Amino acid sequence: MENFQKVEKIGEGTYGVVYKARNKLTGEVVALKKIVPSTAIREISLLKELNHPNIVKLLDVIHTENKLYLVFEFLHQDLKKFMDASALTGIPLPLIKSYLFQLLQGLAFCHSHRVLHRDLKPQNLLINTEGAIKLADFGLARAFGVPVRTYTHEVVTLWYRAPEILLGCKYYSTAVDIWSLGCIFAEMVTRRALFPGDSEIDQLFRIFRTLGTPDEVVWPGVTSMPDYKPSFPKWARQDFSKVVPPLDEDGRSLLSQMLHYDPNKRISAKAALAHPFFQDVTKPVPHLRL
Numbered sequence: 001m002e003n004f005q006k007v008e009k010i011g012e013g014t015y016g017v018v019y020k021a022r023n024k025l026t027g028e029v030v031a032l033k034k035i036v037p038s039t040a041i042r043e044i045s046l047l048k049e050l051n052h053p054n055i056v057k058l059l060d061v062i063h064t065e066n067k068l069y070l071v072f073e074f075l076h077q078d079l080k081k082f083m084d085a086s087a088l089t090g091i092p093l094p095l096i097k098s099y100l101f102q103l104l105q106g107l108a109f110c111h112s113h114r115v116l117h118r119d120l121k122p123q124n125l126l127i128n129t130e131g132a133i134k135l136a137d138f139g140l141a142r143a144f145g146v147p148v149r150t151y152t153h154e155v156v157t158l159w160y161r162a163p164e165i166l167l168g169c170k171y172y173s174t175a176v177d178i179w180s181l182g183c184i185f186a187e188m189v190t191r192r193a194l195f196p197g198d199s200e201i202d203q204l205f206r207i208f209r210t211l212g213t214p215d216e217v218v219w220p221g222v223t224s225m226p227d228y229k230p231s232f233p234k235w236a237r238q239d240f241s242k243v244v245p246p247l248d249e250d251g252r253s254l255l256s257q258m259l260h261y262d263p264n265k266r267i268s269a270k271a272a273l274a275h276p277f278f279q280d281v282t283k284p285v286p287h288l289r290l
Ligand SMILES: Cc1nc(C)c(-c2ccnc(N/C=N\O)n2)s1
Pocket: 010, 011, 012, 013, 018, 020, 031, 056, 072, 073, 074, 075, 076, 077, 078, 123, 124, 126, 136, 137
């Protein structure tokens, strides 16, 4: 731990602040996240062996006097920022399409080894001047979870949370990740969050008012879920043409499938890569201001 010299604060996570750190030894620049039991360790240690070009590498795990340290490779920017930096113009489609392609490539990899992220948001997606984007804090939800607030004495984000999770399902699959990504995808195209809910019920209803209130017809077993309430308002499904304009039909189709209520009907990572939308996929370069 005394092998790193803090430089600045890359930000604050839901369970620990992130710092950019100089590696006294190698002298390499790394992302250091401070955070305990043994089960977690065995788990987060297992993540070290998991590596993919689009999965932000967990270089080394460091546990000292009940003070956990995650050492990650460093990337200079996250999508949340890059987006704020492109709100006026907007990310070019070719970059959106590639960013989604690579993201699923990664998702496909993790899910393949049955590793869910549970909490994908732009802020956990990192990019480099070379045109690549990677997933960060992946598989960390399994190790621990989330309090009532956060370490930073605040509150997380529900905006990208799937409905099964919002409805009480305690045994959710990889499908939840596809939902989050699909939301992100939509944000990239419109430059505004899809379901910016400010509470679980707001989150749910906001989702209801766009895709209609679910039921056994489109989501078999939906009424038997823990937090499902028969008294839910019955909204009608809005036209997707009004949701992600001006995205083309290939996009709307692909998105529609990433947002199917029924998790098992929801499109998978491996499958999304073969969807017509990636017929003309390339690898543009971003224009980050460092
Ligand atoms: C929240 C974050 N979680 C991780 C793992 C982050 C991260 C990872 C790599 N590089 C960076 N740096 C971003 N800007 O300087 N941030 S930011």
